[model samples]
Target chain A: HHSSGLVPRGSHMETVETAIITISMGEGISEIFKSMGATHIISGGQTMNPSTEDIVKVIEQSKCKRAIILPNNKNILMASEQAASIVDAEAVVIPTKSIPQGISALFQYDVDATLEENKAQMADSVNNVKSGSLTYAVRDTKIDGVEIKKDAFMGLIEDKIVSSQSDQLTTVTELLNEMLAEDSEILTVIIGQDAEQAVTDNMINWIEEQYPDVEVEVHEGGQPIYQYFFSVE
Target chain B: HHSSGLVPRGSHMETVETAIITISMGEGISEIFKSMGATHIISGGQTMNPSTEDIVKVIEQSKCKRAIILPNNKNILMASEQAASIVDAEAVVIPTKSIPQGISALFQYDVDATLEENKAQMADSVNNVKSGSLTYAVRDTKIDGVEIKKDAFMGLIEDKIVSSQSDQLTTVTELLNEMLAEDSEILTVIIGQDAEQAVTDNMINWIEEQYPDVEVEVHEGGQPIYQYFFSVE
Candidate 1:
């Protein structure tokens, strides 16, 4: 078998066995994936979704025997699943509906672990964290008994709008309160494109005063639409 | 003055005093800049170029007192220069006409050095390496005594068309021969989107056999247009 010479040497394929691909709109999140050893990061999110063929091509080009896809947006998960099903490699999709959940799952990735083993661990890790987001509403709508207005701040926990406010800080605070559990030890805030640095700094100080035991870590996620992404664990 | 409350606390600004921005077309090259501590990467190149406003906004958003711009394509360098001139920060543009030149400049960057000092070093580093590219001609042309046909492989060194060949391997070999100096020690190949993995692997072996003294380094740049980018130093 070694004498066949069909296995191409000196190619990029010699470097990776199990490839991790993530769909991200933000450079900060993409860098985080790459820094954590992700094989590829596809550019797409809520505003746009990559085609099934796009995902399939990246999978085939990866040339790895196994692949794990993290579709950070709920809209992208279905396409990711289809790509995984049709690829030559043994592939799996971690049902991460947000960037924070995708990141949490990435922390559980083990290069030495088997594909199925890593899949179970990463999937389990998603449930250990509570995800929240702060964004603006484009049109007036009521969801889950929450009154919303066009261009008003919408605070969401797990995709359900729980609070609507005229002021940005108030919506952020209410979202954090809803996301925080009694045993919450860490809070990660991913700052989006529209967020003001001064306001974000002020919010951090307020959090330290309100939740003295919680540790806060901030990332300039530069994501669009959502003003912030919060993960409490 | 140092005790004044103007500086926002717990914000991402505390980490960077000088920011480096690079315009990149490929994920692999963008990752290279990021891994080297580039503050921001603007998505643009030959097929597309970022606007002056786009460059200006990233500079303003960086919030650093000092900034550096690396316009990896000649087309974007003018816009970069304009952004540097009008920004509130002390900024400079290193005339990097190619991605290899940009990477070479990045190698000369020192965090502790003054803006002017870093600029001089980075600019000087660009001249130390010979840059080459292998691409197909879009139209029939005669340039610098070389006849190029549409769809024919065109080998270029320092942006000048040097050889035209029908075969991909012949073009790559010819480009290398034209680029290599008497004291050349290293060859770097950045594989583009259209390149085949098997052919690239074969080319590396051929380089090793022909130029025994040359150390080869390969990168899956995943760039568009060109099939490969080569640098000899």
Candidate 2:
């Protein structure tokens, strides 16, 4: 189990007999979740969050007695909760604030525990993880003390603008260093669908050298918008 | 305007407007129709067809006041007709027996007339076109002197069984060749989404050589299952 920020719980792999469903708003992310052995995939996320009716339909179609729904985005959480309430079967929602929280919850999932116990474990694990997003600013904006240009790279921590720079790598690396203190035990890097393999490899190498004590894992998440989603635990 | 499978009475072009609007059961096909430059596109062409309310929505959204709708499959005709009856807009639906007829109607469109006049011309043109389909036999049966396996390809022309074959390409090509010979002025070929680029290109090249006087155009239609679609005048 790894907490990469996109999917919160590895409960799908756990033996609570719970189904793990990944809802992707578009083509690429859906494919990734399917590959990762998600029992059900709803084709919408982020910019295209599936409607409550759509979520309920997926729940009704899924062949599981118990399910733990992870709404990765804040906007989708309420709809996911509404869907869970309408379903006949036992459904629990783990409110994963972001993709990173979701990934962390998955990694920290306790397969040996009961459904209730695992839920507790997953929920607690979400707080232990920190997520950072690396993306280009769509428009000129100022947050905190950082004034960003339209084309400038912005690094966001838990959706708050934390760092900005003209060079993408510089901005990302600066954010990563700031987030990673000596207590950071694990660093998981999720590369987006459009990112080049060479860039990811270079980042991975840099992380290994800088934080030799920290365990690092890299995965091709096939997500859109953000070039990289970073989680430190 | 157009009748007996010939050019419309006053139009310079030999063809008429043919609209194929793929409705996702619930969504409007307006943007799709507009993008394809369809003279007439109706709402709902699948499952339970569009109600009067559904048709009104499409008519209100469409730029052209007069349009022809093709209820390509049988079950949709009544709903299409019902929608056509209530509106002040001139909406005519051609009772296309299947998806093939709808495609054939598109190929039959007349480019010369105003959108309103072309709508009438295209609606009449549907009668001249023939539709054929090749699908798998759901259960064991014999068709046209051939023993069909449960999953074997069964070819249907104008909703009647024409031939059966083991291979998809072989049966499709056979029907295409037969259709080509029946129409002397057969010109364009349109391949559906299921077909690979190579297979479509090969078919286009073959058709180009066979009918040197005709022009062939291929588009990546988002239709499922069917490998190829053709329009001939």
Candidate 3:
């Protein structure tokens, strides 16, 4: 629920430019945001959600007259939109539901483009990538016909429970099989904080052998909870 | 020597928007530049100058299509200009003679303004503020009829030897008096790495009693070489 600027549009063939304010949980993901040219990276994502006041205060301090906020989580989207409504500066929320989607959108951001043009481009970029996350189930009941088991490795595709296994490696491979399509040219695997290098290396080796055509790029996301976050495009 | 952009002018509203790349000597002063919305702050300044390649690489990495570089030292200006010439991105150099001038110029920067408009505005801003620095003489001889002694505190007005004194306080006050004018509205004092807190407190207290009308802002610059850098606007 955001309000538009009250001023009349000028017919000067130009509009306001945009600055990006995104949330990050760790320094690893934060560096990626900075390298991709995020104006400001607010330190809160996943378990820690930044409040509307925090977003509004950052907008007030930002140098740019217009801002685009990437919530990067479905739970934080409403707070981000509320922040956009009250701020004096012009603001828009992209409603990115995951880190992978957020990163994809930022890749399409062009600084020279007008705000409307960039917004359209970035929004289109979000749907082009498929996101997946692998983690151990905290307390499991039957979900999506999967057997109930606490501490079992769980694989999710866009937050929907898709694969469950006793073995960590099986869950990852199953998730990749569900996510990777013939049209997918590249796959990005972001290693979480608790993930082991030996395990990640094994996953990479498996991906290379199984899908020789799909290009793989790996990064240390350093996020908590999820062992690995996968992006396929 | 910098070359101009070879593209033809567009009839549309924008000529291009600009990003800033500035040279910083220390972390303290670098924070000020970040607060002022500098797009990138290079780590070399003062005794160490960033190479042309360094500037060019930063320009290449910058998200903006056009860049404005602030070479805050005379020695770095030629290198900055050289970087501007060879870089694929459209670049311009604002030859700010000192840190104070660089800060003043950045204060006038508008994100929405066209490249040409911002260049003119920032260049004009550099001249509006008077710059001064206080440093101890290494091996002094006579300069501008003021007898400078070896290891004596020297007060400089725009890099010229103006006053020499054994006392640090006297040298700072003399530099301030020479730099401040009746019409001056604000004073910015940057404390260097070796500057004592007690001495800085004494100087501020003296300014408060002596010049009540001028607003004073103090920052710990943590820069080496000079004990204090002054800016009067």
DockQ of the candidate models in sequence:
0.01, 0.00, 0.00
lDDT of 1 by residue, B106-159 (tens): 867888888999998888877777777888877887543334567777666666
Candidate 2 regions with alpha-carbon error over 4 angstroms: A1-17, A25-27, A44-51, A109-114, A137-150, A196-210, B1-233
Task: For candidate 3, give the docking quality class from DockQ.
Answer: incorrect
Instruction: Report the poorest 10 consecutive residues by lDDT, candidate 3 chain B.
Output: B7-16
**How close is candidate 1 at the interface, in terms of C-alpha RMSD after superposing the true interface residues?**
31.3
Candidate 3 lDDT tens digits, B1-233: 11366421111122233558887755346666867768687765334468888777777655458999998878889989999999877889999977767877887788888889989988887767777788886786654333356777766666655445556775566456546655678998888898988879888876776677899998777776678878787
lDDT (Cα, tens digit) per residue for candidate 2, span A1-233: 22367853121333324666655544345555545445665554344467788677666666567777777777778888998899886888878776556656666555456678867877777677787777786787754323456877766676555445455654565456556665788888888876767756666665666666788888778687778878787
TM-score (chain A only) of candidate 2: 0.74
lDDT of each prediction vs. the true structure? 0.72, 0.58, 0.71
Model 1, span A1-233: residue lDDT tens? 12353422211332357888887755346656776668788776323477788788787877878899998888888899999999988989999987767877887898889898999989887777777778897787755323356787776666655444555765566456546544689998888899987769767876776677899988776777788878787
How far residue A166's Cα lies from its native spot in candidate 3, in Å, is: 2.2
Candidate 3: where are CA atoms >4 Å away? A1-18, A24-36, A41-54, A85-88, A110-117, A138-150, B1-233
Candidate 1: regions farther than 4 A off: A1-16, A25-36, A43-53, A74-78, A110-117, A137-151, B1-233
Residues B1-233, model 2: lDDT tens digits = 11256321110121222323323222232333444555434434333455657655565455435656666667777777887787676677666656566656655555556656656565665766545554566688754223456755544555444334444544444345444542356444545455567645555665565556655555655554445555556
lDDT of 3 by residue, A88-199 (tens): 8789888788776787778678888877887887887776777778888678665433333677776766655655555576556656765775567999887889887877
